[PDB]
């Protein structure tokens, strides 16, 4: 683990542990190729299937902030937002905020879903599994949407809303938008097993 490159020159990428072996290949924090100073790399992903499994998780999360039109294209603002979120996260947990983010992504991913498939001649919805990459995709989607929905029409700043969302999802506590949505999707999936 001789890797002295750190996010914003503050957060060490050594000592980030991904517990789920399932998604360990689809979160890019553990290998040296995936360490970065900054989450804004003008990467040419999306060109091939599964390329964005190599995009750093912090960049994926940042990319998912620039949403709803009046914020399209505004990446520097999202990078600043993530910076403040991370400072707050370590100013709450006193722990490596990469680990908190990664735990939240893992904890906020649904493992089942229910969709309308055609069995033997008749269509109706059965339960199906979720691939690891779509698990990570949906996890980021849920956390970002929860934070953006908290921040709307509120004196709370989107950075602080995001930080609360990530710490709560990392705890697994059923109080963040991400956890409640995960569990509701998985309940709708179980009901039709």
């Amino acid at each position: 683990p001789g890797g002295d490159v750190k996010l914003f020159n503050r957060w060490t990428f050594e000592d980030v542990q991904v517990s789920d072996i399932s998604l360990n290949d689809y979160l890019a924090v553990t290998s040296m190729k995936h360490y970065t100073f900054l989450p804004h790399s003008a990467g040419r992903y999306s060109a091939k299937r599964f390329r964005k499994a190599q995009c750093p998780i912090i960049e994926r999360l940042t990319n998912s902030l620039m949403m709803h039109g009046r914020n399209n294209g505004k990446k520097i603002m999202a990078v600043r937002i993530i910076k403040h979120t991370m400072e707050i996260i370590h100013l709450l947990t006193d722990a490596n905020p990469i680990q908190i983010i990664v735990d939240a992504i893992i904890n906020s991913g649904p493992r089942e879903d229910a969709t309308r498939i055609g069995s033997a001649g008749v269509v109706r919805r059965q339960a199906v599994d979720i691939s690891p990459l779509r698990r990570v995709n949906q996890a980021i989607y849920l956390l970002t949407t929860g934070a953006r929905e908290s921040a709307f029409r509120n004196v709370k700043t989107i950075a602080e809303c995001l930080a609360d969302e990530l710490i709560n999802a990392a705890k697994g506590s059923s109080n963040s938008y991400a956890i409640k949505k995960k569990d509701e999707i998985e309940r709708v999936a179980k009901a039709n097993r």
Binding site: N9, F37, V79
Partner: protein, 140 residues
């Protein structure tokens, strides 16, 4: 005798790094590289210096003239300017083996400190305001 003049290119921005055998100096348009001023993308301009080390720059002054493009595109052009200028300096004046070294450190981190993006802005076509978008269609 050391002097090379190497460029780096992005969407439309181009930076050009002129090199002398000085002490530690890096200046973009006359100002210190410490002060390229979108500061969120400031560690991006510093990516090569911390990738090699200030020590690898103990005997060169860099005057980097940057132009065109926008703020992010100029930052990425400057990135490429430091990287390719260092590669060319170690090519022509230091050694062929210790330029392979620095090439491998630079190109294990990111392949576009040395290779520029061929991506350009796709032209616009009539029937919509954009390359791909079209005017909203109504039937009744």
């Amino acid at each position: 005798p050391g002097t090379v003049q190497c460029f780096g290119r992005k969407k439309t921005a181009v930076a050009v790094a002129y090199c002398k055998p000085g002490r530690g100096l890096i200046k973009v348009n006359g100002a210190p590289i410490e002060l390229i001023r979108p500061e969120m993308l400031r560690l991006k301009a510093f990516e090569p210096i911390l990738l090699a080390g200030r020590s690898r720059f103990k005997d060169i002054d860099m005057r980097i003239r940057v132009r065109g493009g926008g703020k992010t595109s100029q930052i990425y052009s400057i990135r490429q300017a430091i990287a390719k200028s260092l590669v060319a300096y170690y090519q022509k004046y230091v050694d062929e083996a210790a330029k392979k070294e620095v090439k491998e450190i630079f190109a294990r981190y990111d392949r576009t400190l040395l290779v520029a993006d061929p991506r350009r802005c796709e032209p616009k076509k009539f029937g919509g305001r954009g390359a791909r978008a079209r005017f909203q269609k109504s039937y009744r």
